[PDB]
């Protein structure tokens, strides 16, 4: 069975696997350690970007506003923000970089503009997500230390919230459509969830990778002839310098989507 397949996958992987799939056709779900906390890592960027979109619903000027990119803003990873040192980037462009290239500088600007990590948590709360919690900026929010509650959430919680953001009540139509466009254009997840699904399926996702070989991916999937599916696959390991295993996420995705 699916459950027996996942536990077997987990057992041979050498880590801890968290899975949460919601079939919007009938709201049925497939859960594996879905109520356990995991470090979100860069998948938390979706909540930061969405927080800015919610504000833009009340300020038609926000998204095009500018922020200047200094050389001191560059952190451990910023492939897009680097191309703009001494120049500027609009909040929209920062949202794009943070999500489609997982630019860490871009994420920080968004957090800064919102007023800090605590504000992102409040936004999550306003959405009915009582699990999510952002405590730090990039890149320290990626330490993913076992048992550390900072910057974590559960698979089910993130699945429920990702659903509300992309297919439900969370955002106004234009903003919601913008978030979806950003997710579909992601360039960092070909070896993760996407790798475990039929080539024709349309997918929008946000990956994450941190210490303890933490490998994550949350996505919205549009089959050719069925209602959408929302999937969260989190994976983490016992040793601080373990390698990431994007292939485990692909395997989990194939296991749970069998039949759609």
Curated annotation (Swiss-Prot):
Single GO BP term: response to antibiotic
Active site: 42
Residues that hold substrate according to the record: 206-208
Entry annotated with the keyword Transferase: no
A single GO molecular function term of this UniProt record: beta-lactamase activity
PROSITE patterns: BETA_LACTAMASE_A
Gene3D superfamilies in UniProt: DD-peptidase/beta-lactamase superfamily
Superkingdom per UniProt: Bacteria
Database matches in Pfam families: Beta-lactamase2
Keywords attached to this entry: Antibiotic resistance, Hydrolase, Plasmid, Signal
InterPro entries: Beta-lactam/transpept-like (IPR012338), Beta-lactam_cat (IPR045155), Beta-lactam_class-A (IPR000871), Beta-lactam_class-A_AS (IPR023650)
EC number: 3.5.2.6
Catalytic activity, reaction form: a beta-lactam + H2O = a substituted beta-amino acid
Reported function: Has strong cefotaxime-hydrolyzing activity.
Summary of subunit composition and partner proteins: Monomer.
Similarity annotation: Belongs to the class-A beta-lactamase family.
Note: The class A beta-lactamase family has a specific amino-acid numbering system, sometimes called Ambler or ABL numbering and often misspelt as Amber. A multiple sequence alignment was used to derive a consensus sequence and then the consensus was numbered taking into account insertions and deletions. This allows use of identical numbers, e.g. for active site residues, despite differences in protein length. UniProt always uses natural numbering of residues, hence there appear to be differences in numbering between this entry and some papers.
Protein name as catalogued: Beta-lactamase Toho-1
